Symmetry: D2
């Protein structure tokens, strides 16, 4: 049932839709197939509550304490939420416990401490009013309003914290739509939010097929900001709509993160580096390093080792022991990931590791695949975001060459340099058109580190002290006395 107004409610049509277990591939359950009737209640309920005095004028340590008490309840309820994720998403249970239950609790805490530290400024001003007059001028940080939150399916619990945590800190209320392939952990989130002391209406969860629930949410006259993450294309649709609506928009869209191994870097470290950069969360990560660039000198050395690493990954259920990777989240994405593997074989790249052969009997499983692009043929899997465990590994002679190739992308979100060369590392980072460069790591995210991309990877920044500016605004006040 969904949550709207403190109330577990079904869809007004009494229509419904199936969620699956991606390992076996069967129905796990049902959830409500909501439409524009039920986005509306939910958005009118948050606007009710944003104006309520009990939320608007809630002292600031009380809103810090709600977010504190729920991080305390994600961790107290954390075996159950972790089995839940693994069930719905396919993800390895230990990673559900650590990176979804546990990183989620960490983001709450962090953002909960902002609730109490939200400041404007106190200003000088050369006006200049008549004499015998004086003036005092300030800005006042205030909330943005009702937040439309649309979450992607790769990290359902977390990617929902990543929006609600910072919106609630600010004094915004939210209407949250989880992906249709994964709604269960946000439903639990919402009811633990209320156990922690969050007033009815402050966090509503609407469920449904993306085509319609989504659209209704975006095009609502009482929605003040839209925080989307997903397909970079649908992000354009949201953009257009939000801009003629004059509403604030947060957009985290696609990536084709490159990873760059310089001459002096150790081959065992580089190939262990690359594997972690792209087989983490089955490659289902905006920032996954799907383009590997290794220097001419150690190129083969590196890709040899790397195929040993990927050959030895065991694919299986997320609750089984001995398993390193799990499945894709849906059967449409499984089919899309396999079509890209397949265009890659036809485009003349070298399959060193992987293919399209099903690792299991049931489920949306893909084998971890590596393509070697020796001969620098721009197959265009160098352009395609896959969002699955697929790597293309190309070589390079100069550093100027690799930099150019890294920035021959339409996306620009992340990147890695692997090196103990200060000059180079820092001067590659100088020239990369990437919004979050890592050096001798990849995929590292923190509640205090802002995140966003350049180009076609979105508009805006996500965490840290960037959150606060994007979930707050100011009003000015100038008093002549």
């Amino acid at each position: 049932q969904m949550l709207i107004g403190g109330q577990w409610v079904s869809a007004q049509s009494g229509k419904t839709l199936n969620v699956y277990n991606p390992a076996t591939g069967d129905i796990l359950t049902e959830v409500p197939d909501g439409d524009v009737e039920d986005v509306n209640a939910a958005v009118e309920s948050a606007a009710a509550t944003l104006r309520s005095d009990t939320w608007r004028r809630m002292p600031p340590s009380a809103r810090e304490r709600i977010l504190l008490r729920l991080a305390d309840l994600l961790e107290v309820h954390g075996d159950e939420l972790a089995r839940l994720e693994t069930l719905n998403n396919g993800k390895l249970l230990i990673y559900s416990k650590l990176m979804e239950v546990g990183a989620s609790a960490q983001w709450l805490r962090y953002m909960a401490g902002w609730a109490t530290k939200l400041t404007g400024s106190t200003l000088d001003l050369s006006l200049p009013l008549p004499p015998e007059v004086r003036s005092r001028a300030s800005t006042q940080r205030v909330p943005v309003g009702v937040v439309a939150a649309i979450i992607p399916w790769n990290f359902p619990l977390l990617m929902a914290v990543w929006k609600i945590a910072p919106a609630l800190a600010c004094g915004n209320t939210v209407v949250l739509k989880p992906a249709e392939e994964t709604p269960l952990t946000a439903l639990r989130l919402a009811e633990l939010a209320m156990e922690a002391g969050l007033p009815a209406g402050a966090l509503n969860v609407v469920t449904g097929r993306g085509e319609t629930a989504g659209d209704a949410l975006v095009r609502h006259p009482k929605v003040a900001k839209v925080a989307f993450t997903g397909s970079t294309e649908v992000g354009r649709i949201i953009g257009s709509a939000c801009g003629r609506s004059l509403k604030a928009v947060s957009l985290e869209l696609g990536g084709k993160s490159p990873v760059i191994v310089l001459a002096d870097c150790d081959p065992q470290e580089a190939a262990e580096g690359a594997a972690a950069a792209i087989f983490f969360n089955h490659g289902q990560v905006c920032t996954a390093g799907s383009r590997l660039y290794v220097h001419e000198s150690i190129y083969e050395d590196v890709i040899q080792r790397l195929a040993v690493i990927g050959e030895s990954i065991v694919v299986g259920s997320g609750l089984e022991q001995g398993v390193h990777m799990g499945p894709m989240v849906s059967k449409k994405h499984h089919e899309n990931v396999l079509r890209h593997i397949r265009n890659g074989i036809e485009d003349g790249a070298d399959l060193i590791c992987g293919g399209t052969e099903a690792p299991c009997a049931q489920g949306f499983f893909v084998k971890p695949t590596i393509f070697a692009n020796r001969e620098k043929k721009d197959i265009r899997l160098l352009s395609q975001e896959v969002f699955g465990p697929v790597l293309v590994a190309t070589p390079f002679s100069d550093i100027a060459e690799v930099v150019n190739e890294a920035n021959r992308s339409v996306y620009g979100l992340g990147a890695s340099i692997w090196t103990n060369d200060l000059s180079a590392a820092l001067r590659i980072n100088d020239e990369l058109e990437a919004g979050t460069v890592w050096v001798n790591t990849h995929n590292m995210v923190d509640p205090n580190l802002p995140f966003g991309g350049f180009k076609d990877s979105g508009v805006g920044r996500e965490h840290g002290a960037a959150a606060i500016e994007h979930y707050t605004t100011t009003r000015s006040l100038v008093i002549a006395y």
Copy 2:
């Protein structure tokens, strides 16, 4: 003639268009009627130069010195730029010297100051990586790219500074389009920019009819941000376009600023207050206080005085002595302002001052007009932005009612409260949905005060420390060592 690449250049079609003096309704001159050929060159020239190592890697006190030198040349060339404005815009010469030549120079200085003070952060990190592996994280403030700047016709020199000053501080380059009713002062601006040491291509000025030059600028794949101010409608067009383009957008659109006189406020100090709130810049100001709300008790007292004040305004040429108000900027706006005066007489409001008759023989002149909305009827001089010297003055009994009326607008840009009452003043400001409240003043703008509106008045904030956050972005860097 227009500027593109350090070069005074005509339009490629050779086509041209007339600018006028609004006082003696005559051609003043001609300027280029540019099209999508010449937005193109200009936008490819700024992108050439933004990538320029000269500009990208210009030390930060060198970019501070260009903006300082040119505030020093706005003031050294300031009789000429002030005659220019008055000629093209209609504005009173002393106000050209003070509020266009002199406030601009002040803006430059101020923003030139933040050139040198643009910072990112240095951050903790709870990651984590293996033991014996330590990390450093930071963000780095960087420029947004090529700036599309579209300027309104009410304050041609200043409104242009308001954008170029903060974009250039940041390391952005700009392509500036002035209104078609007023291009001359931005042309002079551009050539003084180069006398001050600004490299060719850093500030291009394209001219033309808004319908086409504008559109080309907005829809250019190499334009990184769009800073528009004008009709709130056209802003919606820009919004849509910018959001499907994934580009940052600055929008300062309409208003209908209310001004509120409480019971205890002196009555002549209120009427002198209101007159300044709406006859400043012949009411041609986004924030002009076009709705007057006075308490029941002193309502008549106040509007009596106020009509004495407006009756005694002398309308004339901007270079003549004895003149208090000048003209409208164009004949289309003159005609629109007169149509609103006229709907107001038919909608049953009381003309206590002003009207539809022409004060002068030549020119786009309007008499300052006051309508009394005794009876508290929702005619339509209340929901329509006039942008001319027209006031509707309504009464009110409670403070809750006036607040409600102030926020029965589709815009929330500014507002005034007039009072010695701390509680009330501060608790009105609490409840107003206005982005910049003044108390015992109106229309006060600083370089250090952020400015923006709520609702239909735009997206984003403009000055102060809000300008750096809107003309910069960050890239993250995390080094594992």
Copy 3:
């Protein structure tokens, strides 16, 4: 016992000293009478631990968690800590629960959230190295070192959490000395700190007579900062010592807060206002408003009411029901407070309420006393901090003279204006030489509000974002490549 290194330890001399109960003035218990042997162990133990990798390089959400769990354990152990305070300090039990157990938990939470948000900057640089020589420059927020914390006896739990909470957030370790009249609640604090996960040595508590334990702490070569609050005189001893030592110093010394009632303010509200301003905490508060200034017009009206209010205060034990005020903390302070009452009767002021007679049979009890200084004599009780429930109430004609009188003090910590006059209120605040003005309140302290005084009331600010800058410092880093 006292805490040093995770260890409950007695003094090396075996010497000991009595703590008492201010309400029945008998021994409550004994605690260590530590000397320079046992300041030394304790300060060598914090320096051991500050250099500890575990503590220095503790991830930043782990240090946030410790402070969060221990706010969670002040509140879980909160009836016991509240009985403890009331026992040792004399304070009313409800206030112990609310303003010592409960404000302390609030301060933890708040500062615990800064643990994770401590940032430096990332900077531009006009240098200027050779060409082809690019550089990146940052500052890095780091901890100050070992903190010597000396706490006053009026709010033992809280005043301790005022210092340890912000030092531990920062990554500083601390050596805490509580007053000798009140050590028990900081001893409990220290052991709950360890139950919450604080490593041994991070918070040591040394106990003893102020003369010697104190001095040893201040003059220790390994103490990096000194945070003192108490007698403004002893503060100058600490000053001298700290400055020849080249150590950072926090000093919160004396006050003589004035409170100002303007003509228009309501008499019942003003006198209820003043009573709360000076009978809160039995007047044992740096910021207590011990000077009352009321306008000529309503002066008598106000002081009449006020004596009704103070006459009706019931003085008694802190655990008894029906009691509004409790005792002084020690018998030396009781005797000093009574000597000032007595000086005041001889100096010719009018006792309108209270006096020198003992309300109770046992204990350090004082009656709440009001002196009417009609005639405006420099009855030099207007220059003496009492720190007890004693008020002098003087009248005034012009606002310029009240402002003069407010700033005829050697202190400048706090002040109140009572009025509903915007111009006057803001403008008085303009001219007051006070570090924290309140308007229509007094004695209001937040975790987010900085606190400090001017003149003889100290050096430095205490809370908010002022804490972080006083408990951190920066190192710069400039890399040429």
Copy 4:
């Protein structure tokens, strides 16, 4: 003469003292030998003016414009001020023009832009007053008061700007005492300050022997902050005095900056690196890298080259062509520098370059001297700040040993690492106890980079955004409405 109140004034005793040319040992001129009569006038004059409404309530772009117009007059009067320095200080004329006239103008500009951007905060609050009562709480950045500025003799114009520029930006007034070996450029500074529009009394310059003028300045009851730089000893004296006075103190004392050459760094770059690190400003620089540490492998290679470099430095007058180094500033410092060279020969170090013989016939000239400490003896030329062109060069085997040696100093002001190893460089910087590490450079100072040292090198930070926290403070304001 001296400046006090806009007035060029002689000392009250009529007593006077000689200033010298350091190249040709001769009187250059005379200046006032002021005493406690004339510190007093000067400090009573700044306090007159700080309270001045003209200065206190000077709009903030007017104070920005004074500092702007005087950077513009440092550069317009810049051949003369540069001949002046060279005359009085001994410094090479081109460096007078570039690093004293020109860096000084840069510092003005930079700090002048912070005049305009000085902000407090606007805060939330968990109070919690009754219900029905709302509150608004802010801090307000204000100036510290009268500034006692004592300047060192190595960079007379600049070191003076370093203080006055940031104090005046803030709204502080200053009383400036230049060294007694160099007063002329601050006298010119002061009169150009007034040509730029600085009101009389805002910058007074008192002159005299350090023993007495200094003391009077420090111990003045109306001096609010003391900004000293010089002997670390005298800094202790100031410390003690300032702390019993309860006044803010800025102290930039001594350094023994180490410089560290790792195995992989190029020998000619390292030795060119070290020479610049210690023969810049004739070694008369707090941060001069007077300890050289080179790895075992390339140690000899490096010191060979380095002696070629120092052997080829030509010592001479600052206005002569072909000269690379000039003289010491006084004959007492010349004699002290030569005594340290001489203890170094007796302590058994290897003179590879330079010595004790006089390069010239007249003047305070020293030859650039390098001592090789093979054998790693604590000769203690490493424990003594020379402030002259003297280097000790020691070798080292592991990186842990060099780090230990770098932090076997009583001062930790600056340091250099030379390498192209990212791990090591970052890490070395991790473990150094130095307040400003450089990598592949040394001696680099910006207006935007904070500067200060650890240990015995002082208290506080100097530039950037650290200035504006040290030259401002806040007052809090909480309004209950």
